[PDB]
């Protein structure tokens, strides 16, 4: 599922995304393009993590110099474990799409 976002093309593992996901991605891309701190709210407990991670990875690929790395913080370790699971699934999907390993590292402290 490759989404032709206004800023660029962004990969996505799951089949379909709700319109609220489109709005989230476009607003997030606007904030990153402005390179200014901002705040936004999304209802779903899950799904926001995958959309955010996919958009950040695509933005990193497009403008690697713009963003050095992502620092994604969660309330509790049991919760951040689910985030690392989501990131692992996304990386597996992207690796299958590309056909080879890429210099991408992701870890939890």
């Amino acid at each position: 599922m490759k989404l032709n976002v206004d800023g660029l093309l962004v990969y996505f593992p799951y089949d379909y995304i709700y319109p609220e996901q489109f709005s989230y991605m476009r607003e997030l891309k606007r904030t990153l393009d402005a390179k200014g701190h901002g705040v936004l709210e999304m209802p779903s407990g899950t799904g926001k993590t995958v959309s955010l991670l996919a958009l950040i990875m695509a933005y990193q690929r497009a403008y690697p110099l713009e963003v050095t790395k992502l620092i994604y913080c969660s309330r509790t370790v049991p919760e951040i474990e689910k985030v690392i699971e989501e990131l692992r699934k996304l990386l597996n999907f992207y690796e299958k799409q590309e056909g080879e390993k890429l210099p991408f590292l992701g870890l939890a402290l």
């Binding site: 709210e41 779903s44 407990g45 899950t46 309330r75 509790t76 049991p78």
Partner: protein, 185 residues
């Protein structure tokens, strides 16, 4: 407040009827008892007995725990969550915010209540489109300010028709909504 309400229900026959209808579990300050009670609550939810977990909004259990499909199906909020108006730490924290950044004391207090309520009531919609209803047993939430400060996604679903339902009307509409959600897509 939870203990006082539980004691009153125990003195009356309501609590025994609730126990008959469904299992009842209560939260305590001690983490070990909290964990054991929640562990048994999960098994009760898996089984057909069901469970009614009484907890505190500020309780660490409320923030740590996440409710998913067939877990915390109906989230009940008994009273607007407000911290005691005697803890002097909040007095500094609040009057300083009034002096600097110009936030009204009542504004910040209601914000602290609404944010906490949204935190403790927003778990049922975790993911995978699992149905569930959030009932707030307090006429205060019906006030415009509370509704306005409520998160947009919940508020827009909320309507004036069901804004101030009586207990019986709320029960009937909850039954009907559960009927609608039971059937597949």
């Amino acid at each position: 407040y939870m203990e006082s309400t539980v004691a009153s229900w125990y003195e009356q026959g309501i609590l025994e009827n609730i126990q008959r209808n469904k299992l009842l579990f209560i939260e305590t300050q001690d983490g070990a008892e909290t964990s054991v009670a929640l562990e048994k609550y999960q098994e009760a939810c898996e089984n057909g007995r069901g469970a009614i977990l009484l907890s505190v909004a500020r309780g660490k259990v409320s923030e740590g725990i996440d409710f998913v499909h067939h877990y915390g199906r109906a989230v009940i909020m008994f009273g607007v969550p407000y911290v005691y108006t005697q803890s002097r730490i909040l007095k500094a924290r609040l009057e300083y915010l009034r002096d600097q950044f110009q936030i009204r004391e009542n504004d910040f207090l209601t914000f602290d209540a609404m944010r906490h309520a949204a935190q403790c009531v927003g778990r049922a919609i975790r993911g995978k489109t699992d149905y569930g209803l959030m009932v707030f047993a307090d006429k205060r939430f019906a006030r415009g300010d509370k509704r306005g400060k409520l998160p947009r996604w919940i508020q827009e679903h909320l309507t004036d028709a069901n804004l101030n339902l009586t207990v019986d009307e709320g029960v009937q509409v909850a039954k009907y909504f559960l009927r609608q959600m039971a059937q597949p897509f």
